[PDB]
Design a protein around this nucleic acid. Structure first.
Lengths: 735, 249, 716, 95
RNA sequence: AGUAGAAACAAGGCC
RNA sequence: GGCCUGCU
C-alpha cells in the first residue's frame, strides 16, 4: 500500500482540511542577488501594456513618458492600461450619488489633519530612499539629512515644524538653480536643476524576499522623502473615504474582513428569491499595479476635492503629479563571473545605459535593449503606471466604485452584482434570473473593469454557486473555516528578547486559539514546543539537568541558591507553570508569589544596566512581519525585568566610508539624553517649540536650582554656582 | 549640579556645541531617531544566530563597575568594547543571570502597585471557579468588544493629560483637567506612586494602558463582558464551552 | 516708528521682543506699535525685577551692582521673556513648590516675601480702568496686580506696593522719558489705540514654477493645463458615457464561463528526464543506529564521548574501500577523510578528558571536500573587460528530472511505527480546569500515536543537526569542526538509549547574508546496498566500512555495512527553519484535532477516546493496486506528520508555487463534487501555471502524482 | 480493475503473436520466465530485449491493450502479464 | 565539486 | 605572519 495524503480530500471537504495544502513548515523562497532584472522586466511590461498610448518628452526632466489615457479601446482580453477619463469620472460621480456627502466630509477631516499635521509624523516609517546618499536609509535619518541639506541651501520654512511648510519648502526646492549635497569617501557637490528633479522623482527598487506562494520573484519600490508627505495626505484622504464604504476591506483587519464577507454573501443570497440564481467569482487581478495610471488618480482626487479650498486641492494633487513623472532606479546592478580566469565582478546598474551587451544573456540583452530608450541618468522613467501598491487605498476606492456601479440602479437589467474588493483581490456575488443573465452580468462587469485600467486574471479566477469561495487566504464554505497554517511561522521565538519572546509566544498561542480555532491539546503542544525551543535558543535550561552550555553554570548556582525554585523564570532556568488558563498572564506576575524576595529584588531592579527604554511608542510594541501579509505591530504584555535587554547592533558600519554617521549618532544621543534629564517628558510627549536646545536647558537650570533650593538639597553656594555656570555657558554660546 | 556640568562639558567641544545651538526643540524627535541601524526584517533568525556569539547583548557602561569582568571559572561577563552607535558596551548573557544571583537587591513591593493590570489579571484568575465542559456547536459571531477591563472611561488623549499631571506635573502646560473623575484619578495615582522609582516612562505607559479604553473586533459567543473577554481563549472553543466565573464576581 | 526701538532700547530687549514677535507668527512690518508697547512692558519688567536682591531675611537687599558673592538672589524672578512652554513650565513649577494656586493666564514675576505672582502691565490708558479690566479677565486671583500709566499714577489692590518707592520714581521717570520722547517723534495719532486684537490667516499652497509645468504634463492626452482640466472636471456631470463605450467596445472582450464537468479536468503532466535524486541533508530511510543504552537525556551529555562509546560498541571494522563513486568528485578524498575522522576520534579517546567540541586539521582532502578557496576573487570591472569568458552568472530554468519510485517508498516508511519513543516533551502547569484535563488526555493520545514514528525521529535528527551546525558556524567560523550525529530515544522496556548515525564536518562558515552557503561533509552508516537504486545517490560517495551481525532466525545474516559520504551545504535561513521542524507536529495534530472537534460538534460529546481505541471510522490515506485503502485516525496522524516533515525537508520555491496553483484546482474540483456548477474563465492558463512549478524536486513531483491519482479517483 | 489476457500459445521461432488484455489509466505488459521474477516488456516505451520486434497499442473504446509480437525467439518464452496502474497472465512458448 | 535556482554563495575590505 | 567586520 502506498500512502497518499491528498486522497484524504475524498472524505474531508477541501476547505475543512485546507491547512494540509500550505507548506509553511519549510524555508520560504529568498532572492540571492540583484533585483535589476526584475525591475527592468517590470518597467518594460508596464510600458508595453500601454504601447498604443501617445509619447511625449517632459520639458523639465527630459524623460520620455507614455500617456495611454483615453487611448484606443482594447480589442483583446490581454491586460490593458487604456483607462478612459470620462468613464472613471462617471464612476466616481455615481459613487458620490450612492453615498452623498462622502467626498465633502472626507475632504473636511483631511483638511483638518493636513493643517494640523507635524513634520515628525514622517519619522514613523520604514526604509526610505535618501537622495542625499542615493540609498535606502531609515525614515528618520533620511528626513534629517534632507532637512539639513534644505537648511544649508536656504529653505528653512520647515523650521515652523509643520508638514505643510516642509512640503512648501520641498516644492520651492524644485525651482532652484543649484543645490549642494555632502558626500564622504567630506566633499560638497553641486546638483543642477534637472539632476535634483530626477533625484527627487526617483524610486529605489529591491527584491522582495520571504514571499510564499509563487515560483518567481518580484520587485518592489521605495520612494524618497520629498514625496512621502503628499502620499501621506492622499492616503489619509483615501482611508477616510474607504472607512465610509462598506464594500472596501483594505483599511480593516482580518476578522472585520470575514464579517463583511459573510454579511455581503448573506445579503446577496438571502434577498435573491427562488427564481434568481446566484454565483460567486473568486477573482484576482493580473498586473494590478502596472495598469493603474497616476494621471487617473489625479483625476479621481480632483473630482473628490471639487468645491474645496484651492490650496487643499493643490496639496492633494501634488502627489499624483509627481507619480506621473516618477523615475525608478534600476537596482543594485549585475554580477559577472569568468571561470577561465576565475574571478567575479560587480557592475552597477547605472552602467546599463552605456555598457556593451556582450556580457548579457539573450533575455537580459533584449530587456536592456527595450528599456534603454527610457534610461535618463541611470534611472528609467515609469510614467504609465504604479510600481508597487503605493496608492493602495485609492486603488481600493476605484474597485469599490466598480463594485457599486452594479447596484441594479445603473445596470438597467435583471442581473446585478455586489461584493468586496481589497486591492489585487476581490469576491463578486452576481445574481440573475438565469444562467444567461449571470453570463451577461459577469461579461459587463469585466468590460467595465477593462475601461478603468483594471484587469481580471482569468487563470487565477473561477466562478461557482454562492456558498463556497475564497478571499485573501480566507476560505468560506457556508461559514469561514480556520486555517492555522498561515500563522504557523509565528509560533517560534520572535527574536526581540527573553521576556518579550516569552510574552509574544504565549500571546500568539492565545490569539490563534481565539481567532484561528486552535485546539486545546494543540495549544498545549505548541506551548511545550515553544518552551523547548525557547530554552534551547537562550541557553536557559531547567537547571536541574546536566546540559552543559555557556550559561549552565550561573543558572545552576542560582538554582541551588534559591529556596523556592518554583518562582524562577524560564529565562533563569526555572519550571514552566504556563497552561491554557495562564496564556494571558505575563511570566513575572504568574511567578511573583513564588519568587524569593532576594531573587525578586535582583530581577526587577530599576538600576539594572540592561533595561533601556527610548520612547512611549517602543515600550512594549514588537514589529513582526507576518507571513503572507504586510509588516504588522503587536502589543505584548511584559514586565520590565533584567531580561528586557536589547540585542547587539550590526556593527558593520565601521568598515564603510559612512563611518562618521556613528559619531553623529553618539553625539545626538548624548544631547538627547541630556535634554531628557532636563525635560523628563521628552520621551512620552515629544517637545514642541521654536527655541534652541541650550536656551531651554540653561533657563530650566536657572529655575530648577532656584526652586529646589526654596525646598530641597541645593544650597546658596550651589545655587549661585549653578547661576554663574549658566552665565558661563551663555557666554560660551556667544563665542 | 551634575546635569548642567555635563551640559557645559558638551558645549566645550565644538561639534556638540553646534548641535546644541543650531538644533531647535521641535527637531528633538528627528535627531533622537536619527540612526544607521535598520529595523530587522527577520528577528528570529538573528536572535538564534547572535545568541551563539560571546557578548551578544548590550548594557549601559555602569555594568563595568557593578559586575566583575569574569565569574568564578573565568567566563567573561562583559566587554569594554562599545556598541556601534552608542556608548553602551556589549556583554554576555551570563551577566544577566549573575545579576539575578549576586547583583544588588532592592524592595520590589511597589511593582504590584505599578503593574496594576497584570496583577489584577492574576488575582482575578486565582479566585476563579471552573465548571463542566459542554460539547455543542458554538455559533461564533464577530463583534466589537473592549479588551481592557480596567479602562476608566477615558480616551488616549483624554487620559494623556491626566498621566502627565500624575507623572510630569510641570510639563502639563495650559491644560488643567476639568472633569472631576480625572481629579480623583490624579489624586489617587499621585499619592499611590509618590516615591516609586521604576521609571517615569514605564509608569506613564502603564497608566495609559490601565486608564485608556481600547477596543478590538473578535469572534465571540456569549460573554461580551470585559472580564469574560480576557479569558475568551479558555471559555469558548470550536465545539466546547467551559463555564467560568472570574474572581471579581 | 521702528527707528525708536533702533535708537533707545538695548539689544537684549530688542531681540527678546523679536523672538516674542516670531512666537505667535505675525509679521512686524504690518503693525509695529505692538512691538514697542510690549518691549516697553518687558523693559519695565526687567527694570522692576533687577537691582532687587534678597538675603536669608526678608527685607530685600537693594544694590545698584551685584557684588561678587553667593548673595546674588533676585527679589523678583521674571516670568515673561520666555516661550509659552517655558512660561507654563515656570508657572507649574512654582505652583508645585510654593503650594500656591495656578493662574490661568501668564504672570510676569514671582516674589518670596509675599510668595506670589505679579502681572505688570503699563497701558496707554489710565490705570483705574485697565486694572479692573485685567482683573475681570483673571478669575478669582490672589496674585497681586500692579499697573502704571503714562500720566505718572500708580495703583493697586490692598493699597499694596511691594518694594521701595525710589524704584517707582525710576519707573515713572522712565515712563515720561518715553512719553516726551515720542513728543519729539509724534506717534500719538495711533499710539493710544493701535492694537485691536486681530487674529486671522489664510493658508496658501500655490503650485508655481517647475512644479506647475509638471502638472501640465500629467493630464489626459487632449488637455493643455491643470486649470483647464480642473474646470472640465468641475463642469463634468454623468451623461451615460460608460454605456456608449461599452456599446462601442469590441465584443471579443468577454469573460465567457466555460462549464467545469467531470470530463473537463485532465491529469497534470509530469516532466520527463533523468530520474530524480536525493536532496536531504541526511539519510532518512537508510539510516543505521549505534547505541549504548545510557540513562542520559536528549541534551544531557557530551557529544564526542557518546559518539566514541557508541562506535566502540560495534565490532567488525574493515579497511574502507570504494563501492559506489561520487561520479563527479574525487572519491579517494572521501576515503582519506573517513580514515582521518577515525584517527582523530582515537586521538581524542587517548587524552585526558574528551573535549566538548573538536576542531579538525585542514588537509587538502577536506579543503576540496568543503570547497575552500574556490570562490572567484572579487575584482573591478575596469580591470577585467577584455576577457572573452567574462559573462553573467548562469541563470536558466533548472534541469528537468522525472519522478522515481524511491520517494514514494521513503514516504511510505516515514509513516511507519517504530520500537522507540522519539519525543520527550517538556513540563506544563498542572491542569486545573476540566477542559485542561480533556486537552491533556487528547495530547497524551496523540503523543502515544506519533512518538513511535519515523517522522518524529527525522524531526529530532534534523533539529539536532541544524542546531549543532548553526552553533558551530557562529562560534568556529574559521576552523573545520567535527559533530557526531546524535539522537536519544527510549526503548519499550523504558531504558533510555543513544544513537549515533554518523558525523558531520562543518567548514568555513563566514555567513553574512541569509543566503550565504556553509558547506559541510556528511558521513552516515547504513546497510542499504547502493547498487540497487543508483540514480537516487547521484551526489553521494558510498564506501564499504564493515560487517554487521543482527540476530535472525536464518543463522545470522552478517550483512555488509556501508558508509554514505557526501558534500552538502546549507544557509542561515535553512538552518533556522530546519531547527524549527517541531511545528510539523503542530500542523499535523492541529489538523487531526480540528477533525475531532468538527465531528464532536455533531454528537454533543467528546469523541477522542472512541476514535483512538475503537478505530471504526477510517479515512482514505492511500491507494493499493486493489483500490483505495483507509486507515484509522492514528495512521492519518502519522501520514500528515510525515507530509509536514517532508515539506520542511524538501522545501523549495517549486513546492510553494505548486501548492498554491494546485490548491486552486483542488478548490475547483471540490466545488464540482459539491454540485455547485463551477466554472472557469481560462483553465488552460491555470494548468500551465501548475505545470511550470514541476521541474526537478522529488517532493513536488510526488505531490503532483498524488494530485493526479486523486483526480482519477475523484470525478466519479 | 480486473484484467484478462488472450492470444498466447505455442509458436515457431521467427513467428508472430498478438497478445490482448481486456479490462474492466496507463497500461503495461510484463513477462515472467519460469526461472525468474518480473521483466518489463512494454508500457503505454519498450525494453532493450524486445524493441523493434514488439508493438504495444490500446483501444480505449474497446477497453483493451494489445501487444503485437513478431520475429519471436525462444528467449521470449514466458507468462505475459498485463498490468494497470495485474492480470493472471497468458502463456507464450517459442521454440 | 557542492548548495541553489531566472542570481548568487563557495568570506569581505583595509594595509 | 600581526590586527578589523559579520543585516550597512
Amino acid at each position: 500500500m502506498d500512502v497518499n495524503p491528498t486522497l484524504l480530500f475524498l472524505k474531508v471537504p477541501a476547505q475543512n482540511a485546507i491547512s494540509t495544502t500550505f507548506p509553511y513548515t519549510g524555508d520560504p523562497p529568498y532572492s540571492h542577488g540583484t533585483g535589476t532584472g526584475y525591475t527592468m522586466d517590470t518597467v518594460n511590461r508596464t510600458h508595453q501594456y500601454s504601447e498604443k498610448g501617445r509619447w511625449t518628452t517632459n520639458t523639465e526632466t527630459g524623460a520620455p513618458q507614455l500617456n495611454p489615457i483615453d487611448g484606443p479601446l482594447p480589442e483583446d482580453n490581454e491586460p490593458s492600461g487604456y483607462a478612459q477619463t470620462d468613464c472613471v469620472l462617471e464612476a466616481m460621480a455615481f459613487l458620490e450619488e450612492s453615498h452623498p456627502g462622502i467626498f465633502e466630509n472626507s475632504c473636511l477631516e483631511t483638511m483638518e489633519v493636513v493643517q494640523q499635521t507635524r513634520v515628525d509624523k514622517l519619522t514613523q516609517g520604514r526604509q526610505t530612499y535618501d537622495w542625499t546618499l542615493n540609498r535606502n536609509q531609515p525614515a528618520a535619518t533620511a528626513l534629517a539629512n534632507t532637512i539639513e541639506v534644505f537648511r544649508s541651501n536656504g529653505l528653512t520654512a520647515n523650521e515652523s515644524g509643520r508638514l505643510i511648510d516642509f512640503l512648501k519648502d520641498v516644492m520651492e526646492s524644485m525651482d532652484k538653480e543649484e543645490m549642494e549635497i555632502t558626500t564622504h569617501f567630506k566633499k560638497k557637490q553641486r546638483l543642477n536643476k534637472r539632476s535634483y528633479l530626477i533625484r527627487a522623482l526617483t524610486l529605489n527598487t529591491m527584491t522582495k524576499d520571504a514571499e510564499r506562494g509563487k515560483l518567481k520573484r518580484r520587485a518592489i519600490a521605495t520612494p524618497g522623502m520629498q514625496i512621502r508627505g503628499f502620499v501621506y495626505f492622499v492616503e489619509t484622504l483615501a482611508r477616510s473615504i474607504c472607512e465610509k464604504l462598506e464594500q472596501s476591506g483594505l483599511p480593516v483587519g482580518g476578522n472585520e474582513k470575514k464579517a463583511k464577507l459573510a454579511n455581503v454573501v448573506r445579503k446577496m443570497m438571502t434577498n435573491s428569491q427562488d427564481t434568481e440564481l446566484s454565483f460567486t467569482i473568486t477573482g484576482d487581478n493580473t498586473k494590478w499595479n502596472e495598469n493603474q495610471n497616476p494621471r487617473m488618480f489625479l483625476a479621481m482626487i480632483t473630482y473628490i476635492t471639487r468645491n474645496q479650498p484651492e490650496w487643499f486641492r493643490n496639496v492633494l494633487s501634488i502627489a499624483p503629479i509627481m507619480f506621473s513623472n516618477k523615475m525608478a532606479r534600476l537596482g543594485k546592478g549585475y554580477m559577472f563571473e569568468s571561470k577561465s580566469m576565475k574571478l567575479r565582478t560587480q557592475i552597477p546598474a547605472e552602467m546599463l545605459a552605456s555598457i556593451d551587451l556582450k556580457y548579457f544573456n539573450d533575455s537580459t540583452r533584449k530587456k536592456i535593449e527595450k528599456i534603454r530608450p527610457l534610461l535618463i541618468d541611470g534611472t528609467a522613467s515609469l510614467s504609465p503606471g504604479m510600481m508597487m501598491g503605493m496608492f493602495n487605498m485609492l486603488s481600493t476606492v476605484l474597485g469599490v466604485s466598480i463594485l457599486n456601479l452594479g447596484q441594479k440602479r445603473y445596470t438597467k437589467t435583471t442581473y446585478w452584482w455586489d461584493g468586496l474588493q481589497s486591492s489585487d483581490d476581490f469576491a463578486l456575488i452576481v445574481n440573475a434570473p438565469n444562467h444567461e443573465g449571470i453570463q451577461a452580468g459577469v461579461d459587463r462587469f469585466y468590460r467595465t473593469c477593462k475601461l478603468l485600467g483594471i484587469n481580471m486574471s482569468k487563470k487565477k479566477s473561477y466562478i461557482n454557486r454562492t456558498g463556497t469561495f475564497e478571499f485573501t487566504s480566507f476560505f468560506y464554505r457556508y461559514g469561514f473555516v480556520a486555517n492555522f497554517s498561515m500563522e504557523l511561522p509565528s509560533f517560534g521565538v520572535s527574536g526581540i528578547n527573553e521576556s518579550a519572546d516569552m510574552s509574544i509566544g504565549v500571546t500568539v498561542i492565545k490569539n490563534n486559539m481565539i481567532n484561528n480555532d486552535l485546539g486545546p491539546a494543540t495549544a498545549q503542544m505548541a506551548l511545550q514546543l515553544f518552551i523547548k525551543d525557547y530554552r534551547y535558543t537562550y541557553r536557559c535550561h531547567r537547571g536541574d539537568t546536566q546540559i552543559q552550555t555557556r550559561r549552565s553554570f550561573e543558572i545552576k548556582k542560582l538554582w541551588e541558591q534559591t529556596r523556592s525554585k518554583a518562582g524562577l523564570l524560564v529565562s533563569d532556568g526555572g519550571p514552566n507553570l504556563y497552561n491554557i488558563r495562564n496564556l494571558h498572564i505575563p511570566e513575572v506576575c504568574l511567578k511573583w508569589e513564588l519568587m524569593d524576595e532576594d531573587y525578586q529584588g535582583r530581577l526587577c531592579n530599576p538600576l539594572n544596566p540592561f533595561v533601556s527604554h527610548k520612547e512611549i511608542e517602543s515600550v512594549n510594541n514588537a514589529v513582526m512581519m507576518p507571513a503572507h501579509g504586510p509588516a504588522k505591530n503587536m502589543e505584548y504584555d511584559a514586565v520590565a525585568t533584567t531580561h528586557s535587554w536589547i540585542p547587539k547592533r550590526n556593527r558593520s558600519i565601521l568598515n564603510t566610508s559612512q563611518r562618521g554617521i556613528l559619531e553623529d549618532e553618539q553625539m545626538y544621543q548624548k544631547c538627547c539624553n541630556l535634554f531628557e534629564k532636563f525635560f523628563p517628558s521628552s520621551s512620552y510627549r515629544r517637545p514642541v517649540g521654536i527655541s534652541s536646545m541650550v536656551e531651554a536647558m540653561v533657563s530650566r537650570a536657572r529655575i530648577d536650582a532656584r526652586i529646589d533650593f526654596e525646598s530641597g538639597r541645593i544650597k546658596k553656594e550651589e545655587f549661585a554656582e549653578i547661576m554663574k555656570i549658566c552665565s558661563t555657558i551663555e557666554e560660551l554660546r556667544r563665542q | 549640579m551634575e546635569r548642567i556640568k555635563e551640559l557645559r562639558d558638551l558645549m566645550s567641544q565644538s561639534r556638540t556645541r553646534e548641535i546644541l545651538t543650531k538644533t531647535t526643540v521641535d527637531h528633538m524627535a528627528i535627531i533622537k531617531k536619527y540612526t544607521s541601524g535598520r529595523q530587522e526584517k527577520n528577528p528570529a533568525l538573528r536572535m538564534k544566530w547572535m545568541m551563539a556569539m560571546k557578548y551578544p547583548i548590550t548594557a549601559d557602561k555602569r555594568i563595568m563597575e557593578m559586575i566583575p569582568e569574569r565569574n568564578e571559572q573565568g567566563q567573561t561577563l562583559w566587554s569594554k568594547t562599545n556598541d556601534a552607535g552608542s556608548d553602551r558596551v556589549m556583554v554576555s548573557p551570563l551577566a544577566v543571570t549573575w545579576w539575578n544571583r549576586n547583583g544588588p537587591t532592592t524592595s520590589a513591593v511597589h511593582y504590584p502597585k505599578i503593574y496594576k493590570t497584570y496583577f489584577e489579571k492574576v488575582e482575578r484568575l486565582k479566585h476563579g471557579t471552573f465548571g463542566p465542559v459542554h460539547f455543542r456547536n458554538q455559533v461564533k459571531i464577530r463583534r466589537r468588544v473592549d479588551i481592557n477591563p480596567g479602562h476608566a472611561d477615558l480616551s488616549a488623549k483624554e487620559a494623556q493629560d491626566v498621566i502627565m499631571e500624575v507623572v510630569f506635573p510641570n510639563e502639563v502646560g495650559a491644560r488643567i483637567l476639568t472633569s472631576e473623575s480625572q481629579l480623583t484619578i490624579t489624586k489617587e495615582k499621585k499619592e499611590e506612586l509618590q516615591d516609586c522609582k521604576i521609571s517615569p516612562l514605564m509608569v506613564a505607559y502603564m497608566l495609559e494602558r490601565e486608564l485608556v479604553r481600547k477596543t478590538r473586533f473578535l469572534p465571540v459567543a456569549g460573554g461580551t463582558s470585559s472580564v469574560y473577554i480576557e479569558v475568551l481563549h479558555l471559555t469558548q472553543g470550536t465545539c466546547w464551552e467551559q463555564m467560568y466565573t472570574p474572581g471579581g464576581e | 516708528m521702528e527707528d525708536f526701538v533702533r535708537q533707545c532700547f538695548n539689544p537684549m530687549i530688542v531681540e527678546l521682543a523679536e523672538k516674542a514677535m516670531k512666537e505667535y507668527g505675525e509679521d512686524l512690518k504690518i503693525e509695529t506699535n505692538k512691538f514697542a508697547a510690549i518691549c516697553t512692558h518687558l523693559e519695565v519688567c526687567f527694570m522692576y525685577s533687577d537691582f532687587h536682591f534678597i538675603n536669608e531675611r526678608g527685607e530685600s537687599i537693594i544694590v545698584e551692582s551685584g557684588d561678587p558673592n553667593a548673595l546674588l538672589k533676585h527679589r523678583f524672578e521674571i516670568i515673561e521673556g520666555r516661550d509659552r512652554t517655558m512660561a507654563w513650565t515656570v508657572v507649574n513649577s512654582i505652583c508645585n513648590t510654593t503650594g500656591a494656586e495656578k493662574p490661568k493666564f501668564l504672570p510676569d514675576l514671582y516674589d518670596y516675601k509675599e510668595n506670589r505672582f505679579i502681572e505688570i502691565g503699563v497701558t496707554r490708558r489710565e490705570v483705574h480702568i485697565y486694572y479692573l479690566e485685567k482683573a475681570n479677565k483673571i478669575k478669582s486671583e490672589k496674585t497681586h496686580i500692579h499697573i502704571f500709566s503714562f500720566t505718572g499714577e500708580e495703583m493697586a489692590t490692598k493699597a499694596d506696593y511691594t518694594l521701595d518707592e525710589e524704584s517707582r520714581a525710576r519707573i515713572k521717570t522712565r515712563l515720561f522719558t518715553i512719553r516726551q520722547e515720542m513728543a519729539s517723534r509724534g506717534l500719538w495719532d495711533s499710539f493710544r489705540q493701535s492694537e485691536r486684537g486681530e487674529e486671522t490667516i489664510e493658508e496658501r499652497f500655490e503650485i508655481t514654477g517647475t512644479m506647475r509645468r509638471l502638472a501640465d504634463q500629467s493630464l489626459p492626452p487632449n488637455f493643455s493645463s491643470l486649470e483647464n482640466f480642473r474646470a472640465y472636471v468641475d463642469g463634468f456631470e454623468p451623461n451615460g458615457y460608460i454605456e456608449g463605450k461599452l456599446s462601442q467596445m469590441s465584443k471579443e472582450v468577454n469573460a465567457r464561463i466555460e462549464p467545469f464537468l467531470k470530463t473537463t479536468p485532465r491529469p497534470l503532466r509530469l516532466p520527463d528526464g533523468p530520474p530524480c535524486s536525493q536532496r536531504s541533508k541526511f539519510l532518512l530511510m537508510d539510516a543505521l543506529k549505534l547505541s549504548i543504552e545510557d540513562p542520559s537525556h536528549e541534551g544531557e551529555g557530551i557529544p564526542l564521548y557518546d559518539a566514541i562509546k557508541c562506535m566502540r560498541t560495534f565490532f567488525g571494522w574493515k579497511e574502507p574501500n570504494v563501492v559506489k563513486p561520487h561520479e563527479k568528485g574525487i572519491n579517494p578524498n572521501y576515503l582519506l577523510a573517513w580514515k582521518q575522522v577515525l584517527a582523530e576520534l582515537q586521538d581524542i579517546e587517548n587524552e585526558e578528558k574528551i573535549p566538548k567540541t573538536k576542531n579538525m586539521k585542514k588537509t587538502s582532502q577536506l579543503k576540496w571536500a568543503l570547497g575552500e578557496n574556490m570562490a572567484p576573487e572579487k575584482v573591478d570591472f575596469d580591470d577585467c573587460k577584455d576577457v572573452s569568458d567574462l559573462k553573467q552568472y548562469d541563470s536558466d530554468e533548472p534541469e528537468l528530472r522525472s519522478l522515481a519510485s524511491w520517494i514514494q517508498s521513503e514516504f511510505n516508511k516515514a509513516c511507519e511505527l517504530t520500537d522507540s519513543s522519539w519525543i520527550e516533551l517538556d513540563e506544563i502547569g498542572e491542569d486545573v480546569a476540566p477542559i485542561e484535563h480533556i486537552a491533556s488526555m487528547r495530547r497524551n493520545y496523540f503523543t502515544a500515536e506519533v512518538s513511535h514514528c519515523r517522522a518524529t525521529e527525522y524531526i529530532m535528527k534534523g533539529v539536532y543537526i541544524n542546531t549543532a551546525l548553526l552553533n558551530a558556524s557562529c562560534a568556529a567560523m574559521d576552523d573545520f569542526q567535527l559533530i557526531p550525529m546524535i539522537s536519544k530515544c527510549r526503548t519499550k522496556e523504558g531504558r533510555r538509549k543513544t544513537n549515533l548515525y554518523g558525523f558531520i564536518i562543518k567548514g568555513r562558515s563566514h555567513l553574512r547574508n541569509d543566503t550565504d552557503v556553509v558547506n559541510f561533509v556528511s558521513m552516515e552508516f547504513s546497510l542499504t546496498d547502493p547498487r540497487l537504486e543508483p540514480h537516487k545517490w547521484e551526489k553521494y560517495c558510498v564506501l564499504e566500512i564493515g560487517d554487521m551481525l543482527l540476530r535472525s532466525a536464518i543463522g545470522q545474516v552478517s550483512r555488509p555495512m556501508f558508509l554514505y559520504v557526501r558534500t552538502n551545504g546549507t544557509s542561515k535561513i535553512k538552518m533556522k527553519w530546519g531547527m524549527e521542524m517541531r511545528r510539523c507536529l503542530l500542523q499535523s495534530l492541529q489538523q487531526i484535532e480540528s477533525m475531532i472537534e468538527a465531528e464532536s460538534s455533531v454528537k454533543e460529546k467528546d469523541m477522542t477516546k472512541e476514535f483512538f481505541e475503537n478505530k471504526s471510522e477510517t479515512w482514505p490515506i492511500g491507494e493499493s493496486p486493489k483500490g483505495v485503502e483507509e486507515g484509522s485516525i492514528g495512521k492519518v496522524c502519522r501520514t500528515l506528520l510525515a507530509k509536514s516533515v517532508f515539506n520542511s525537508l524538501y522545501a523549495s520555491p517549486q513546492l510553494e508555487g505548486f501548492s498554491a496553483e494546485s490548491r486552486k484546482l483542488l478548490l475547483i474540483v471540490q466545488a464540482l463534487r459539491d454540485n455547485l456548477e463551477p466554472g472557469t474563465f481560462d483553465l488552460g492558463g491555470l494548468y500551465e501555471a501548475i505545470e511550470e512549478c514541476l521541474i526537478n524536486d522529488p517532493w513536488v513531483l510526488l505531490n503532483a502524482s498524488w494530485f493526479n491519482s486523486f483526480l482519477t479517483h475523484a470525478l466519479r | 480493475v480486473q484484467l484478462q489476457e488472450s492470444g498466447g500459445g505455442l509458436v515457431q521461432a521467427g513467428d508472430s503473436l498478438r497478445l490482448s488484455c481486456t479490462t474492466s489509466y496507463g497500461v503495461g505488459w510484463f513477462r515472467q520466465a519460469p526461472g525468474e521474477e518480473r521483466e518489463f516488456g512494454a508500457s503505454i516505451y519498450y525494453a532493450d530485449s524486445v524493441k523493434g520486434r514488439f508493438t504495444i497499442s490500446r483501444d480505449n473504446a474497446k477497453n483493451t491493450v494489445y501487444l503485437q509480437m513478431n520475429s519471436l525467439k525462444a528467449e521470449d518464452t514466458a507468462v505475459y502479464y498485463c498490468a494497470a496502474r495485474w492480470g493472471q497472465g497468458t502463456q507464450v512458448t517459442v521454440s
